Design a protein around this ligand. Sequence first.
Ligand SMILES: CCCCCCCCCCCCCC(=O)O
Ligand SMILES: CCCCCCCCCCCCCC(=O)O
Ligand SMILES: *C(=O)CCCCCCCCCCCCC
Ligand SMILES: *C(=O)CCCCCCCCCCCCC
Ligand SMILES: [Ca+2]
Ligand SMILES: [Ca+2]
Lengths: 143, 283, 283, 267, 267, 136, 68, 68
Amino acid sequence: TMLGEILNYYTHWTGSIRFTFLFCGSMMATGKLLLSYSPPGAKPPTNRKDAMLGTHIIWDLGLQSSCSMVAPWISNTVYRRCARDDFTEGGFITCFYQTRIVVPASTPTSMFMLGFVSACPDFSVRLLKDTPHISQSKLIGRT
Amino acid sequence: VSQPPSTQSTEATSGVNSQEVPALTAVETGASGQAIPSDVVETRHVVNYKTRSESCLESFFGRAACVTILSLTNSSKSGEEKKHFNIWNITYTDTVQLRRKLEFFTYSRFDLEMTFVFTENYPSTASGEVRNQVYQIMYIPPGAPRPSSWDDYTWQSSSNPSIFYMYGNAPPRMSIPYVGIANAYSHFYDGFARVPLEGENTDAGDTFYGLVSINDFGVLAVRAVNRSNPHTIHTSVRVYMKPKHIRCWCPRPPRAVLYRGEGVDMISSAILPLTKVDSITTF
Amino acid sequence: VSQPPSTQSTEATSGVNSQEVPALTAVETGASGQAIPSDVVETRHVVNYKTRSESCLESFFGRAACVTILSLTNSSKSGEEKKHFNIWNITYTDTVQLRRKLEFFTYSRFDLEMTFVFTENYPSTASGEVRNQVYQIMYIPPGAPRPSSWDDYTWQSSSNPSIFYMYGNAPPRMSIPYVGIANAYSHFYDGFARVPLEGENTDAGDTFYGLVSINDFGVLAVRAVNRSNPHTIHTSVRVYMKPKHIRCWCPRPPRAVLYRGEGVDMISSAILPLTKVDSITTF
Amino acid sequence: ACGYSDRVRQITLGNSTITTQEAANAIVAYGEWPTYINDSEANPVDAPTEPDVSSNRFYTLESVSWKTTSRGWWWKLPDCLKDMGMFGQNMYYHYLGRSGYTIHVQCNASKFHQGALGVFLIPEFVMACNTESKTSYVSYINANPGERGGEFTNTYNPSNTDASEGRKFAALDYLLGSGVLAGNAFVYPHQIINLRTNNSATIVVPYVNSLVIDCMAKHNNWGIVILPLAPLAFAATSSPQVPITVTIAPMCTEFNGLRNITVPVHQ
Amino acid sequence: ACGYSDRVRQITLGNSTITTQEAANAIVAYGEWPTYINDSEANPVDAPTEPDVSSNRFYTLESVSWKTTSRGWWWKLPDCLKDMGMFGQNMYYHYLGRSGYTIHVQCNASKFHQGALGVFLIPEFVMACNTESKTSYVSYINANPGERGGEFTNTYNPSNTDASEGRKFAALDYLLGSGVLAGNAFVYPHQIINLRTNNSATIVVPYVNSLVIDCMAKHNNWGIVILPLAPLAFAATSSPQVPITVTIAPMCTEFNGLRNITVPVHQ
Amino acid sequence: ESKTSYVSYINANPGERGGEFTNTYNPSNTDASEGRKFAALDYLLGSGVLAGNAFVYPHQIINLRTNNSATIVVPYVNSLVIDCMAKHNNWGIVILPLAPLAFAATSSPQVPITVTIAPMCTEFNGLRNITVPVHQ
Amino acid sequence: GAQVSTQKTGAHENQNVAANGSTINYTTINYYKDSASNSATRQDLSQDPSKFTEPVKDLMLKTAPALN
Amino acid sequence: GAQVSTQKTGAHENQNVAANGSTINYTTINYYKDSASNSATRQDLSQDPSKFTEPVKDLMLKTAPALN
Ligand SMILES: CCCCCCCCCCCCCC(=O)O
Ligand SMILES: CCCCCCCCCCCCCC(=O)O
Ligand SMILES: *C(=O)CCCCCCCCCCCCC
Ligand SMILES: *C(=O)CCCCCCCCCCCCC
Ligand SMILES: [Ca+2]
Ligand SMILES: [Ca+2]
């Protein structure tokens, strides 16, 4: 993701991440989801009764299409390593149904929602490093 | 004395039960999500001192990146005269690291810092004697006559800017103004070098489309100034570019797949950036 | 103009016969002994000018200590390509001198001065000809792609900081900020990189325990930029670290026994620091 | 205003946030909001423990299901939370506990459904036992279901013999299992989730008791009851079903009398 | 206000007027509005021609159709207007042309449809050619479709042999035919027509280039792309279809270098 | 001595029981279930430093003929403000008999040593489901 | 013709406040006639994320209905 | 932008007093934009041995009974 691609040019990062979702079902479909960020340290939230015990928000589908759930920068170190590392654990963002999407007569019974990620104004990244995301065949020459 | 701008601090907040819902929005508008900790959970007061001091374009592009590697050979053998020099076309597409970064923006404007690193070695077992090498980098702008042989009149450089390196000394380097003939450097170009009129090929254009068809910065004619010795010697010159005093406009997504040619072009061979994940519910 | 603080001077004193006994105390409190000459014997007046000016942490750590020795070989023989470069893991545990000193404190915070010394020589009787060598030290932070061969795209360093040395010139050196992602550098770490939960090995952790399991500063990818010559050449690069602008917290006893690995670990082979003394009454 | 709808509303406590785009205002029980014990009203003299965020947040109970047959549901505060995260721990480690809560009942359908849930918050919700052989005959285990809570029925069949069927509430819907016509259950703080109108119910409630602080492990101050005043209905099937979720959040919680933890009888 | 909805909106230019009762605001590219060349920024010294109303109006392109199979569409400014009334004439009679536009993408359905179109306005929209035998191999004819514009596909099959299939863009949807994940196409001025929310998209865009004025007949500043981020869907058939119409309106247009008219190669 | 920093979480975190120091060092290079534990070598703090200098740490000495208690108040210490407790133990309490217990009567005297700890200024961030580490 | 400026707070440095001592001053004297030859332009931390995160015409404020 | 300071009393130098002549002054001009690049921080002879030799709560004075 744009956020990711950028973080990947640096070594450390700090800040809060903004997860915003846009439900694209039919106007006629209702429902209440539950987005959640559980900071590291315990059994990863497999069920709702566990995700609900951490940072969460009960999103009610309605006229307001989108809904954001923020991942409050909660960390032990002040900066997290960009590369994957256990010391710099991030946490678990999951989702569940608070109730269940409900549609009526003649209404598409299955649809989707788009998930976006962005950084909050308290976000900063440091230590310029090269990015792994691109490769290049050792250049020819002429010898 | 002044204080660099820090990233938003966190002001302490608490509960809520209003008709004010910072959580909900409508990204259809085209506006990104805005919420922050305070809007969603109970926060504490936090004084942030940290700064995006390193994401400043000038810092982000503040490195001498290698753009190309030229080769040339000072040999005394039959067909080793054309080898006695080399002509490189000025550009950053020869590699992919710097290119990708600049490629983050549609347009850019800057001054340039050229730095050169020479590395000579012996090819075959002709591991004999050769005096110290003195190289010459001559910048030949579009329109200027180009060298025929490693030593035709062109290397006079009465007007062309030329560096003279004495192998073993500090990596020669120099600065270049923003020379673009535009108000800015164009990184992409959805157009053709000229307009194909009514009576022409039904394919006209396929030859002159793309930024590459209009951009031109001249070439670097490198060479060793010494004459040919008994034993043949091989040198490799590496060009380094650091755009400084920069500023860019219009952000675009990063190059996600391998680069083919100088244009956008992709290769069916590698166009799967991402990676299969067990399940949508696989942490 | 100012006057550096001197060590306690001795004020003249004499006899005594009071109920004031500076001699006696009770170290059980946890407080060290405090008495000084004056408290015990008759002293004369002495004006002390001397200063602990050299025990200042900045002075005590003010030296470019060698931390490691890397080797690499620019050869033209079959399996001498992987030898054409080397990757060193950034740390001070490779040696013991500097390590022990820093190891005097639990935490520390400082800027770093890197200094490099190159020394090339001929291995076998391949004592022939080879042009001058140009090396490259590339700092590859955690997460950045690492070199596959002594010359794959990675050595572009469009973002990674790289030095280019021209053997024979002054020992390249450079400075590094306090980069720790903590508020200070942690010298020890009584913890595990992550928390092993209920359903796991009854041994989980044995792999990720110790400061070493959480610390990571990236690596130094060194190499010679020249191509392979007839005769093989061997180079040894020595890394020197001098922590400057320093400050440390929580003093701990010095490492008394030989070092095993990067952790505290001892070896039954050598764990007798002290030395037998004839008798408790042997001067 | 910038269109500050009476329907849209957000609520936040601890690290939890509810939202709802179709609510019908919110009510504050008896007009009073949760408060702490004031030095002039105090009783226990030990310094109280006030969990704040660690326990004063939004805990979500296992949803139930609304069927054309559904007769009603019930729960008990603090009971139906005794197992909810940190709140519980504090609740059980202390002899005395005090708290108020924000009740948020959710239940979305579609503009083509019918139905109306009466969400009532009744203080001191005592129900009759199911056995005319004894009186006030209810086991602790049965009285305190927890996250599950009970359900109402529309029939009364006491087990004067089987003493294991007597030791439980006689959840008679048309009488609140109390011996009072449910038709007047509105003299209690309440809201009505009428599907064609709203999909949420928010009722903030303050501690209520003849004492300042009490012993939670023995007493349930409030009782949450939901009765379908209007039967669920859908044009399609004759067996429609919609989920009803209950999310509770304690507030201004404080405890006195700390000791070893309390672990009640269980099965 | 008197109920000035963020949804309802009218737009007028020349003798043309758009209206929409369900839009989601409107966005102004990079926050700047169309302007003219200021005496301090000018380049061509001849007195410019500023058409105003005659050309700065709402031209409507032939609608396209959204199918469950539809992969996306694209167009190019000023290209996709080179034939639009008076604007075109001026565009072609002049060497240099400058302009900004107001893009209005329309697409109504019904409260029972699903779908979401990502309308992006990308500056310098260069796509890869369909032939791995050559590079930047695209014919003028193919690069400049006009009112018709192109379409995106979800497959990449270069014709290294057939040189008449190479001379055209490789409109690979999941990569914008540029070699960049469409998932990040949002770093461009954009709006999303999510059927359950809106039915219009309005994006005002200012001239963008490394120059003040350029030669339109050679260069397309902007590129309009529409990708179904959410597939069209209707409860009824499994082959639903809805029209998508694109109405563009140039603004602050000025041209320099007048001569005989330009007539490019065609078939 | 077959591995380095080889200690299991289970063994590193005994709890109320804590460990004990010994005066011998016998590594189990083979038996990998005896390696995964601390080598509590008393005369070296099991750290490789003479215990004789363990006094450069906050401390007190319970000398029976003088006192019978030891009170040491300690502040949070770390290279960070707050950390993750379930992974890291900031402090370590160690008690070594600098003077051997002794009683005129038996040649096997015994006296109880009790340890009472009290946390202060405790604060936590990042609330979620409860953590339950590996156990036996 | 030299111009002194503030350094970038280092390790054991001024509390982030960068307002402690002249020991954080670095001197600069341009030596060439052409600006292009100068060091990196001074760090500029200004920014307007909005031209990208909110280039919407009518402005909407968090607490309000994005779609009124 | 240069900052002059006192040198470290040498061989045939000012009576330890370090207060004799400007012949004991050294000049310093930081050349880099990053503090990290600077020389060793100025000698600081401050010290509080007590946080280690006497971190006792109730303070005791030499002349008194350590255990009262
Ligand atoms: C003696 C050395 C002369 C070197 C002349 C180089 C000319 C600079 C052209 C600008 C190249 C980078 C701009 C770009 O492609 O974005
Ligand atoms: C071009 C050379 C780059 C060298 C980068 C070195 C990174 C510094 C990490 C700090 C290492 C010492 C800190 C410590 O281990 O206590
Ligand atoms: C302003 O420049 C006054 C301070 C001058 C100090 C001398 C600096 C050294 C000379 C600068 C380069 C001159 C090159 C001809
Ligand atoms: C304060 O700095 C005024 C004194 C300047 C004397 C000139 C010192 C020599 C130049 C310093 C380095 C400048 C690097 C651009
Ligand atoms: Ca701030
Ligand atoms: Ca003195």
